Subunit: 288 residues, 6 copies
């Protein structure tokens, strides 16, 4: 449930992230503060794009660091129907305007990702698929927490978060280890009981090797849909407990083709690499 | 010149940024290192998208922190025509694979922005415009240095970098100050001699007030082209020291409509907010 | 293989950790540097305790930050038979002596943990058990990387590393959620496909609920051995894909009693909470 | 001094940064388990399952304060622990309590384990009729020194040498590097000037005499047998009444009384920080 | 207005700075805390030097981090007539005494700089000059925010803040670029529309070259006053839009000689490099 | 001790972190001016334009090392400067030299300004026939203490009290909070134990006696007139010859000899760090390619 997802974000982690963002945008003197002064002010947050609202905890944490308060008129995960009054921000005018750009940039990107995730989830559901749409590690460096949180609000799985999560054996690992069996054997030893092992496979031959070697997940990468489903079918027949992930060249438009009864996970780089930010503005309307 | 832009980036700043990205992607043990081992290896960097290559100094910095070396086959800012082999990375296998994702993520986004900038610059040039296409502060939090560098590689101006660079008077500042004249007066006091003052104007009226009050730059925001140019015409005529910037609802497709002889700068939020990342892969061989 | 484990540790992570340790031990002026001077020097590292050598990469990283070099005479994971010559460190005298205490403190604790892990692994093997001895999150705050690395060198599984690794449903979670079924359902939703769910069970009845709700691992906590094995037996019979962990009151002495064919993992807080540091010294020669 | 007053030694900003690093270590990204417990206002009881001395309240409090939780203590800092004891209650949103749980217990367990060891050593020294100070050393877990030294203090031991900026310690290695005791102590005395003491690690009576002659404030008689230690300290004290004598090396709880004597001022023990088992604590939501 | 200048300082930036200063002064245990105890206490801040009071926001931030409260009896920028009771600080005794030294050190230097700036501004005004007295980047490393804020409280321009502000072309850049025209052309390309370009000139010839190539400011460096004013006059005659800055060997005593109708800015390294700290003391007078 | 050996006091990791924070302060984002100079291999000369004492080479070097530049010094650390002197060369890519320039010169200028003030005070004390130590205090620029204390040492003064973990300083504020000199010193002595000294700030013979009786290692006679200072120190040293006596408060270079006497061990001066003008240095690029 989108409203309960904020509990995932430790307050100390947010504070440090928010502080680094404010430092980036104002490393020294805030000259513009002299223009607005410190009079108690109110600003309206407007949604000018359709999509899904995501990023309230980051938006809040920015303004909290600046001694401003936010009242939300729509819950986290709400559908946005522009032009929508989303929230009021209240505080000293210079603080409101110091937080403005960082807060809007954060909300815009978080929401843009949640919107893309929601559109993919809807397309998958419309296709009658009961698997999970998932994101990837193809996130903006330093900004992963916000992007993965956005995926979650949109109803996608955050999935592989970092290199300390499940042990991912890619094509590159196979080359370095000298074969699928050797690579998976090593991965299984490293993962032990606490972590899953996933193996990126380019053919059915590779997928059977991976499964026989104890992979928890087999990632069928850059298959054509007509090859994907027969491969997954055969795999599920022989290894019923192995999960199947599809990835590579999947878009919102072709997503239904990758949906099938033997695919458990569909991961999409585009959800984080190519989701346009939503258009939000913050308008100061009263002061003193 | 794109190849000289890397000089803008202090090595200590890059190192700290790069370290934070590596910490994000691997906060504890790198379990996958045990799969590849440490054998000396090589990987080919492939460009799978058209556009402009940008972000070599960040890609290099990442691998340097991981004791790997990079040989580039194309200069920074070169056109990418897929599928193109663009670099080789050398080092211990586990180090190559530890840097892979962060390095690709960085290059993809920097290049995505450079590509959008170059398309905008080309459209403006095709329109016969001699002004500057510019970016904005609508950048991903924590990632501004990379995004601004990407704009520069693509031939756009980085323009307003942060809140300490020029004193920007926006709609909000006008409301808070109680009018354009009062806001600009205060901004000029604050800017003194070292900083410029820019004023965001939503109307002809505000634009004229800002010029008359002594702003260095007047930003004509969300004008229709048919209103923009007549407004800019009177500013250049009566205030020839003022720089005129256009922004708001500008896209690659409509950019030529915003180009005109009295417009000096066109800033586009889309160059950083809506530039799809390019497709790159790194393949051990 | 113990010698290959160092690949798990990113060099940038080590450097930051090491820098914080040096800052802790010398926050300002290093007055004692004026006593020794900067003359090129050598020191011998002596092992004065039996056990397993662990922590070379950290020891090395400390001295590297101080522009000193280490030559090891025994591989990582070696049995230590006192009094053993283990390594030589070379560099300016004051640098050797500035690194000495931090390096010895680190090696002593890493090795003390590896020694305890190796003893437990040996006792389990002597009992004919083929499961994995494992550590826990009961580590010294800020020092987890070293402690977990030590466990690995000793042949134990590092196991649960942090709160992002598998979703652990404890007694407390059960209370908060209002029951095992509700807790595990929520955990399974949060874990999705990428993470395992483990459930801490105090009784046979909780264990079955956890398995029925789809936990990947059932942790049988603070069972007597005579209750543990019958419980695990039924679990494996009815839920063949669920892994069984035993924990709670397990010591080196009683470990063989907790070993059985239906126990997959045995985790011991004592390996990190009560492993005495080994005795090492560093002597200029 | 008094255990309850020792928390004043800890600056709140230093604690906050330390606590933040610990929380980051335990949860670098998403806290998935938060979705299991939810955010309902909750309470948890802190239980002591080991005998010993309670130490580490300020760190325990700081951890929970960062997580917007409140702690009520039912025993003062430095209390004897008689298990199974109800030590405290913690209140807050369920997920915040459970996020702080492990880090808070790990910290309290180790701090108390060290305070317990220190208290046992202090008691053994007092039972021997010795009026000197039991002290710790710089043999602490890297990054955790503040907690370990605070734990020694709560147990009634001296924190003693805290870091390399505190008193100029001339060890064996310095003597080798400087080319002799006299040269090393002369240099140390120049570096220490008026603000810092000089201590010299000595392996014989002759070295101790040379060190005292050259102006050492403390002479550390290292790895002496008790039968050699006391005659050495006696002679030293006769010739240099102002010089403090420290004994260290192979001292344990069991043999501590043997190292106690009228001419020993300080007994330092690496074991108090290197070999003190953590106490068993649990935190149980109710 | 001096009282409004605190708005320039973001609270998160201050907190981080203040935290580093407290860490510098007490990296481990605060042994002296055991001497004073934690009893609620009060301490009076006394000004023992004449000058201008500056640095209240930093002083406050220090004590705020230590859970102490400050009541000021004089506004920021006030003239100090010693011996004057200027604030009271209240909090736990050990907290007051932990913040004492860092807080006094900060106020003393910020006020010393504000005092020097005010003296220079007064001398310029007494000379009938309407230009701006300015500081420079000749600030104590890590302490620039405090020093530049002190300049402002004293009525001087902070002026060039860092290397991300206006593009300064110095002697060294001219040599490296191979000439004034080349250097200024490059600087103008780098500065684009957002930033000004300033050029340090040692002759009239260089000043004209700079102005012709599009410099916004010409800095006439280490001119004798008798050479300075004729040079500025000719420059303004030909390039009316160009601002003229004078610098080099300017002191409080000789400042009026550098004042003239064609000089816009006078920058003085001495305002930050050679301003003696003011004498303040904090006297804990009550406890319990 | 010897000025050239003092750099060993400074851990390389501590310097690197400090230096990095200074560079970040001066250039938080893009270094626009780099495009003006380019990266061609260049050389610059460091010129001393003020008399005094050279101090701060390790910090100056660390700044440039972080920027991949190298420094050749023509004078040792602690050398007397007699302007105008060309004292070093720096080599590196032009943009790196010019990026480091201002921070390096600001650091050297202040370190040397303090070293110069310290050396002047030491010389005045020596000219007065005094064998005690001239010392600094904690009245240092926040965040810059390492440089300033290092500067004092190069100038021949004692760094002395470095921070709140070094010796337990009982000021008049602590006496008030504790409820009296004896109570404050007893508490201080308990906190200091064997590892730390206790110093007590006293405004009278009577307080100094109480402090010494309670076990103070140092008695700081604060803001005494010289005519009261020496008789007080004399009488106190008689009774407590193991106690060291420090004088402070209102001491200047000009009046320093009046505070010098046979029963004063340490003279601390806030002015050495609070009122030492920075020296004038410049860095002039003379070669490129």
């Amino acid at each position: 449930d989108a409203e309960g997802l904020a509990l995932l974000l430790p307050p100390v982690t947010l504070a440090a992230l928010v502080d680094s963002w404010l430092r980036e945008d104002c490393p020294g003197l805030n000259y513009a503060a002299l223009v607005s002064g410190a009079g108690p002010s109110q600003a309206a947050l407007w949604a000018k794009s359709p999509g899904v609202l995501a990023g309230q905890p980051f938006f809040d944490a920015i303004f909290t660091q600046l001694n401003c308060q936010v009242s939300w008129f729509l819950p986290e995960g709400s559908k946005l129907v522009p032009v929508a009054r989303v929230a009021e921000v209240r505080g000293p005018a210079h603080c409101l305007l110091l937080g403005e750009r960082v807060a809007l940039n954060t909300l815009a990107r978080c929401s843009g990702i949640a919107s893309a995730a929601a559109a993919a989830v809807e397309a998958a559901r419309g296709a009658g698929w009961t698997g999970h749409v998932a994101g990837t590690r193809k996130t903006t460096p330093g900004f992963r927490l916000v992007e993965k949180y956005g995926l979650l609000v949109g109803g996608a799985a955050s999935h592989r978060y970092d290199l300390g999560g499940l042990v991912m054996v890619k094509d590159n690992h196979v080359v370095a280890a000298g074969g699928v069996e050797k690579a998976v054997r090593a991965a299984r030893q490293a993962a032990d009981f606490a972590l899953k092992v996933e193996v990126e496979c380019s053919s059915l031959q590779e997928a059977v090797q991976a499964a026989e070697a104890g992979a928890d997940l087999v990632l069928l990468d850059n298959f054509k849909p007509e090859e994907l489903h027969p491969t997954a079918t055969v795999l599920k027949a022989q290894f019923p407990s192995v999960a199947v992930e599809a990835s590579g060249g999947i878009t919102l438009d072709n997503l239904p083709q990758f949906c099938g009864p033997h695919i458990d996970v569909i991961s999409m780089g585009m959800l984080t690499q190519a989701a346009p930010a939503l258009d939000f503005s913050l308008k100061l309307f009263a002061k003193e």
